[PDB]
Amino acid sequence: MKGFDTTAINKSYYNVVLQNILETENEYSKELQTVLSTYLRPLQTSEKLSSANISYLMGNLEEICSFQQMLVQSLEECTKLPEAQQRVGGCFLNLMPQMKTLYLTYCANHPSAVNVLTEHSEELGEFMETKGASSPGILVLTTGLSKPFMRLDKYPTLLKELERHMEDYHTDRQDIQKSMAAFKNLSAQCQEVRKRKELELQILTEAIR
Numbered sequence: 001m002k003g004f005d006t007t008a009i010n011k012s013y014y015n016v017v018l019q020n021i022l023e024t025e026n027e028y029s030k031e032l033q034t035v036l037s038t039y040l041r042p043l044q045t046s047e048k049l050s051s052a053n054i055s056y057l058m059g060n061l062e063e064i065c066s067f068q069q070m071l072v073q074s075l076e077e078c079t080k081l082p083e084a085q086q087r088v089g090g091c092f093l094n095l096m097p098q099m100k101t102l103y104l105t106y107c108a109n110h111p112s113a114v115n116v117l118t119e120h121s122e123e124l125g126e127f128m129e130t131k132g133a134s135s136p137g138i139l140v141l142t143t144g145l146s147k148p149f150m151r152l153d154k155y156p157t158l159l160k161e162l163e164r165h166m167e168d169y170h171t172d173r174q175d176i177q178k179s180m181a182a183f184k185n186l187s188a189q190c191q192e193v194r195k196r197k198e199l200e201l202q203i204l205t206e207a208i209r
Contacts, residue, residue, distance in 0.1 A: 001080040017161050018079060021154070025072050028148045032061075032068045035140055039128040040065075048127065056109055056116060060102045061145065067095065079162070088158050089179025096182050106149070107190045113142055155183050 009015055036044065043049060044065070049058040074095070079086040106113075117124070117139045128138040136143060163176045197204075 004081045013161060017158060018076060021076075021158055022072075024151050024154055028151050029068045029072065031144050031148055032064060035134075035144055036065060039133040039138065039140070042127055042130060043124075048124070055105060056112065057141065060106050060109075061141065063098065063102055067099070070095070086162075087175060088162050089175045089182075092155075092159075093179065093182060096186075100182075100186060103152075103186050104189065104193065108193060117142060152183070152187065156180055159183065 040061070043058070044062065046054070046058055046062065049056070049062075053059075054062070075086065075088050075091045079088075121137055121139065124138040128134075134140050159176060159179045163179060164173055167173075
């Protein structure tokens with residue numbers, strides 16, 4: 001976007017928000033791009049984690065691959081250039097349906113995740129190389145894939161100023177309601193999922209010894 005308008009910038013929050021977000025999502029896409037072409041390229045084809053295993057590792061990361069690429073290249077690519085009437089929500093709203101699946105599962109499958117690793121440190125730790133993988137064996141996944149899930153707390157930022165443009169109220173913002181209500185509902189459910197029917201303890205009557 002060397003010249004998406006050529007307008008003399010100054011006090012423009014727009015160019016400041018889309019920029020800041022870069023630093024974050026960048027390192028997010030940067031982490032995936034690395035491990036991906038680094039040691040994931042092989043398994044990327046669902047080699048050992050073809051069926052079943054999908055729900056665990058691949059099903060999440062394997063999908064985020066195309067996601068992390070469109071993630072920014074989807075909306076930012078248009079906003080940068082003459083946005084005219086861009087909308088982070090309208091777009092994210094299309095990628096959410098799939099994200100909601102990878103997000104909810106990961107949070108609930110996380111516990112098992114760490115297990116598969118130390119349990120597959122030798123089998124998975126072997127395929128990774130096939131030349132010269134990183135240093136933290138194949139477990140690099142969890143570790144390097146624990147931060148990227150933190151940038152979700154900043155998403156609402158763009159949905160706030162990038163969607164409002166100029167405050168507004170008569171309309172336009174009306175979309176932010178569903179936008180913030182979705183991306184947010186993701187994290188709001190994770191905390192409720194664990195307790196989901198666990199805190200009720202009314203009809204439950206396990207036969208624990």
